[PDB]
Write a protein that binds this ligand. Structure first.
Ligand code: SF4
Ligand code: SF4
Ligand code: SF4
Ligand code: SF4
Ligand code: FCO
Ligand code: FCO
Ligand code: F3S
Ligand code: F3S
Ligand SMILES: [Mg+2]
Ligand SMILES: [Mg+2]
Ligand code: NI
Ligand code: NI
Lengths: 267, 551, 551, 267
């Protein structure tokens, strides 16, 4: 028997699910056939409509106190929950019901972890985080837009293998992935240190791999593993390595608030 | 009649509800409803035009890349910026590789389980299954040994009693027509598809910085630093690495996905005679290759009343005929302003009042082109290419037809493409032609860098007063996309996205005309109204993306 | 009667010359000569004991990892250091994965072209070739389609007139006995082997920090920081990544390599009655799992005059009977001191004087065990395991035998393992058993970390006076390896490596007794003295490594 | 027709050839079947002895002025070259004969680039670099022990695709791979800057991924791309990332000369 997972998307763009399709350890096919039992996920489920809602209800019962609940996307509270309705009910109701019997609860992505893009600006829908919707519960936050999928998969594997969550910081983020500022572990720090800065894309220093601070790099105010774990497991791939500043997508008040070219505060 | 609701529709992106009235087992009327809104258009307002693309890319993570690219193209349009040709090559490689991933996932992960019965696959003979493909495909992973391994994974899953994503599927439904052996083949291909789409996104990652959600664009070009002799930048070693993944895609696409598309049509030929959504089709040209945002590798156009011979070519993303024709209505959507609006004058003022059959019933707007309902996406893009007499497209369709004819003894006529299966075929043709796009553009890049052009970015200036407008078109995996930006006093004063699933899924319009999803469902037979598989077959053929449709 | 030279012997590591006297069409006498020397033992002298491993790892890049590990074990022995158990798990995984890559490359890239004729593959029928493997393998890449693509790659290479490394090979030689179909199957497996070996080295890289030439060892344990909750260190994500590669090795090893080994025997059974190199065999136990450098997963021992029943087990790397038996002579080697030397008192003083049949003819020393010539390597290690009654080894050998039975109607007895083919078979058995080693040690590591043990390193102290002697044993891919370190006043005062290819390749010894290579060749039929394929067949069976043999 | 390559090993350990078996772009099989025609390489050649030396002589004549010559290992000159004899002649003679007709000449590895480990300590065999053996030729140096194989393959590719070598530094090393000190592009530079140092393997700072300077890291005095391109294309794999200091194997006078724990000079 494999450990059960219930995945509910709220105001999600599906990028957080799609991250799993890039994963290699495990691949999504090994995740769903070998690592877990994915009891509800609307993107991949054979069943639809009444049949899929029946699957969820049956799972919530059969695996009460045993399943990991995962949520992507923000949860909209304005106007009594009507900005996300599934099977004729606000999503906040579906999430609260599923949370009741969960062994562990994960906010995958910046939207569920802290509101993310969907809660930015004027916040049209009163979008909030998963933790805000579940005040009595400990929500494990896995931010990024989307995070590297293994930030999530190794969090789940820690629960499965060692029987408890990984160590968390004071935002309930796993320290193995979010324990350090990107700028406090970035390969371009020597250039920062020497005042060696790209000033525009395509300029001489940009074409030598210099620091992107003066292009708006948010590495100095963003916690994450983008410079070490990076993305896609091919080697050498993250935004800064490709030539673009970090935008701060992991980090509340940075990504989606500050302009790309707005300078970060350096500690 | 009987009234049914399908909520949630699964194996799509996002939140969709479909209602149908059924008369004597046949759908008589349908409603499509997007049930989630974020207000992304309002979120991006009042910011620097340069910032929009990072924020609006988050409209959708399935069609990641597409809103990023359309947004920069919109800003560039407003600002009158000509993008460096190296930046075009790079954008083009990203969009073609992304779309390859997207289409493969749609055929296998999202759609195959409408047509494939996994419990029937358990009764298959793996040797017989393999023999069925002799002379039909040259794919290297169709052996009885592969198929036996796959069958045992299925058997093991069923025996665990934990079916998960496979639980309560439509196994043994009267609309499932494939023999056991073909069901098994399809499951094997579903798993193999996952490897190919991962390679496609390794292409995307190496130029984008990651995927989902690329991070290498700019208003004015790209952020990739081209320097064949540079450490830590886009050098020849990195380019070789990208090429190594480009080369891994073609065999699966041509020998598996293309073949399975022809085979599905062979076993389900009735689906060539239903699911017609519209009589007018639009696509935009794509993959610009000159220094002036033009010279597209794929052509665009407008087809009216299904007449390919009189279609109107569109060869420029600045085409005034295209631009002036587009409007959206909210008469039957949950917004306040109902009269058709040109998107530079659009509003998105929410006005939710619950479901009403005859009133407002969706967060999707209703787009029209010169007042007509129009279907967009791979059926439209294929039909336009055929209308243009694009030989590459005609030859690729003919390859599918050849397999279909070998199996059935029948040919396929263009009239039969205005259908659920025609839509699926257009998608497959697209994915196949996109492999040549990738080769062409990788070679173009290498050649151009070799002439001494390493330029990638033109720094913009943004006037601090004045009001100006731009639009960025893109032919996305689900069809024509456009982002419409108005800049006033240096900041975004309006932003409107008109997205391909908006065209196709939008509700009844200002003249109460029915959009493509709703029209396509009229006539659908429904054997069991509690399990309306036939409805989901048709809807899935449009590849719904409701985060896109609604934003 | 005539004298031939084979120089260079190719498809080995390093620089080897083989001379043979042929009389009545059969080899009557042979000389093996290592023709390159570096003086690695002298280069490492006078340094800090802690530094040796990084220098002497460069004795060989084919058997990378092995000299690094033997060197740390030697220092640890001299210093009386007990290695942390986590460091043993990590060392073990590296060694096992490395060896997997090593053996696969040996069977395919180094040895297959002695037995396989690529010209003949062009005449094969791919469907017949696939049909031959039904009920024989469950490998998923033996389809006619796979074989056709491979055949086309050969066709195109031959078509280009640029055969490169396949040029002037032994095509049509009378000793080539495979049918066209089997030649084609072997070329396809040759190519597939390269994917599998790549995966094995991804395991090595993730713990070693790169390969070739790992960089995670230390005298006192390893440099991997274990912290499941740590960013940038060996955490649970990195461990999952390692496991994803360990999991990819088994199918190829079990369904292709193991099977091909049984098949080459079936077609070449005469090579079970030739190529006996010795009557004595030595291996050391390997893969320690306790806190005190013991509790080995694989057993070791000494077999005298081919008698398994009365063999002597070796269970400890501190076994004085093993230590005291080992000596090397340079009577027929290009060094000055000729009498047999215990390695702690060894010298390596070059004394080149050209080739003489009865004098000095090699940079390889001549090792003995209590004055006898001994074969080391996979044949030794399998015979010792059979002697020990190791069920896993019995069972794996039996699987190979059963395939051979099925194909020929004959069985294989232990007497037939003392041969060119038995040597090949022991190597394959080892590679197969190593996959269980990998699973066992990964699981042990995960379990131990879970108990709260993250210890990986104990910092050594090295007394500044005193003289201390240490020896590091390791069962390498080619056999028992030993590094011998003497420390005096804090620095290395003597360093001697006695390497497995030294035992096997070494020239006539102090008593002019013939080493295993030279012995194995007596009796070899040679159909064409100008193209002595049969000689190279036997010599390749030992997997020569001459940078190892000579250092 | 594919461009011809002649590979000759001198006092090599085979690690430089073995790097190719880890390559992915191109893989070794695609290298030899599609990118180049490998006319001579003793590790993979079907032919042996007389037949392989005939392959070489024919190729040197047939492809005169067109082939790329590659050498791994040092070249030993002491006692008239007898420390490496192939087909009864000193390797130095084989190398000089092959160099006469070469279109380009590449020293792959530290041994051929500058003598490397084989020339270290007392230099028992009078081992020297490829360039020392060919004073009148421009030798392209790809150091490392062994280098990442793409440092070599993309150099060869630049020669084939654009018709000339890549841009080289004053040691004739390609700037894309060797143009910067590892320490001037090392992701642990922030820890160096803050005085956050591992003191011994397994200690608390080591287990947090701090800088390895005080363990003897030679990144401050070693040119290379180990911290960016890294190794094996799996993502995150180079010696420092795994927990061990750089030893300076790329760089003459550092690797094989200085102790592992001996501290580097910092610029
Ligand atoms: S965190 Fe980002 S990728 Fe995930 S749902 Fe939100 S917008 Fe999408
Ligand atoms: S500002 Fe950005 S690019 Fe520069 S050192 Fe900091 S994180 Fe790296
Ligand atoms: S450079 Fe290193 S890997 Fe290459 S031959 Fe020399 S010792 Fe071996
Ligand atoms: S001393 Fe080494 S680990 Fe520390 S920053 Fe420099 S190169 Fe990196
Ligand atoms: N493709 C796609 Fe998404 C939709 N509809 C966009 O644009
Ligand atoms: N295996 C190996 Fe190398 C040899 N001989 C060593 O030790
Ligand atoms: S924008 Fe996001 S993905 Fe990493 S590099 Fe910055 S936190
Ligand atoms: S030892 Fe060598 S491999 Fe790189 S990290 Fe240092 S130059
Ligand atoms: Mg809109
Ligand atoms: Mg020795
Ligand atoms: Ni979308
Ligand atoms: Ni070796």
């Amino acid at each position: 028997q494999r450990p059960p997972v219930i995945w509910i998307g709220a105001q999600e763009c599906t990028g957080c699910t799609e991250s799993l399709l890039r994963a290699t350890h495990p691949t999504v096919e090994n995740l769903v056939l070998e690592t877990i039992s994915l009891e509800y996920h609307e993107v991949l489920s054979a069943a639809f409509g009444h049949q899929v809602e029946e699957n969820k209800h049956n799972a919530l019962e059969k695996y009460k106190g045993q399943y990991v609940l995962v949520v992507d996307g923000s949860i909209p509270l304005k106007d009594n929950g009507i900005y996300c309705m599934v099977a004729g009910e606000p999503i906040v109701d579906h999430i609260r019901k599923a949370a009741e019997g969960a062994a562990a609860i994960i906010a995958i992505g910046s939207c569920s972890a802290w509101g993310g893009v969907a809660a930015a600006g004027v916040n049209p829908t009163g979008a909030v985080s998963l933790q805000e919707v579940l005040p009595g519960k400990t929500v494990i936050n896995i931010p990024g837009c989307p995070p590297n999928p293994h930030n999530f998969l190794a969090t789940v594997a820690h629960i499965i293998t060692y029987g408890k969550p990984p160590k968390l910081d004071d935002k309930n983020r796993p320290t193995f992935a979010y324990g350090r500022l990107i700028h406090e572990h970035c390969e371009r720090r020597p250039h920062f240190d020497a005042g060696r800065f790209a000033k525009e894309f395509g300029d001489e220093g940009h074409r030598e791999g210099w620091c992107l601070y003066h292009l708006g790099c948010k590495g100095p105010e963003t916690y994450g593993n983008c410079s070490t774990l990076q993305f896609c497991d091919v080697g050498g791939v993250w935004p800064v390595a490709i030539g673009h500043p970090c935008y701060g997508c992991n980090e509340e008040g940075i990504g989606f608030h500050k302009g790309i070219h707005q300078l970060a505060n350096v500690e | 009649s009987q009234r049914i609701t399908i909520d949630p529709v699964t194996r799509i992106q996002g939140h969709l509800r479909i209602d149908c009235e059924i008369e004597n087992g046949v759908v008589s009327k349908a409603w499509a409803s997007g049930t989630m809104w974020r207000g992304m258009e309002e979120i991006v307002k009042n910011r620097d035009p340069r910032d929009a693309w990072m924020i609006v890319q988050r409209i959708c993570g399935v069609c990641t890349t597409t809103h990023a690219l359309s947004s920069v193209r919109a800003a560039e349009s407003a600002l009158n910026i000509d993008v460096p040709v190296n930046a075009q090559y790079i954008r083009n490689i990203i969009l073609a590789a992304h779309t390859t991933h997207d289409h493969i996932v749609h055929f296998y992960q999202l759609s195959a389980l409408d047509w494939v019965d996994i419990t029937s696959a358990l009764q298959a003979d793996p040797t017989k299954a393999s023999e069925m493909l002799k002379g039909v495909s040259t794919w290297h992973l169709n052996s009885p040994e592969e198929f036996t391994k796959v069958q045992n994974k299925i058997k093991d899953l069923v025996a665990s009693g934990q079916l998960g994503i496979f639980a309560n599927g439509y196994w043994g439904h009267p609309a499932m027509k494939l023999p056991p052996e073909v069901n098994l083949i399809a499951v094997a291909h579903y798993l193999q598809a996952l490897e190919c789409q991962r390679d496609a996104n390794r292409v995307v990652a190496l130029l984008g910085g990651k995927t989902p959600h690329i991070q290498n664009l700019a208003v004015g070009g790209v952020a990739n630093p081209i320097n064949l002799d540079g450490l830590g930048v886009l050098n020849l070693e990195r380019l070789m690495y990208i090429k190594s993944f480009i080369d891994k895609l073609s065999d699966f696409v041509e020998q598996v996905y293309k073949v399975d598309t022809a085979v599905i049509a062979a076993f389900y030929p009735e689906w060539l005679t239903r699911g017609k959504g519209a009589v007018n089709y639009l696509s935009v040209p794509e993959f610009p290759t000159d220094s002036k945002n033009g010279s597209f590798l794929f052509p665009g156009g407008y087809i009216e009343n299904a007449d390919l011979s009189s279609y109107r070519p569109i060869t420029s993303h600045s085409d005034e005929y295209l631009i002036k024709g587009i409007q959206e209505s909210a008469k039957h959507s949950w917004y306040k302003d109902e009269a058709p609006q040109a998107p530079w004058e659009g509003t998105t003022i929410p006005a939710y009042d619950g479901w009403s059959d005859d009133g407002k019933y969706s967060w999707v707007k209703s787009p029209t082109f010169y007042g007509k309902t129009v279907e967009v996406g791979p059926l439209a893009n294929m039909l336009v290419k055929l209308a243009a007499g694009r030989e590459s497209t005609q030859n690729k369709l003919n390859e599918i037809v050849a397999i279909y004819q070998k199996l059935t003894g029948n040919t396929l006529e263009v009239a039969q493409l205005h259908s659920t299966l025609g839509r699926i075929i257009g998608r497959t043709v697209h994915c196949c032609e996109l492999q040549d796009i990738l080769q062409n553009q990788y070679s173009a890049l290498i050649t151009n860098i070799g002439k001494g052009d390493h330029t990638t970015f033109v720094k913009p200036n943004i006037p601090a007063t004045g009001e100006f407008k731009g639009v960025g078109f893109l032919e996305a995996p689900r069809g024509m996309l456009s982002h419409w930006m108005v800049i006033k006093d240096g900041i975004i004063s309006n932003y409107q996205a008109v997205v391909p699933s908006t065209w196709n899924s939008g509700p009844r319009n200002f003249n109460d005309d029915v959009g493509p999803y709703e029209q396509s469902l009229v006539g659908t037979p429904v054997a069991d109204p509690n399990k309306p598989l036939e409805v989901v077959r048709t809807i899935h053929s449009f590849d719904p993306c409701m985060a896109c449709a609604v934003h």
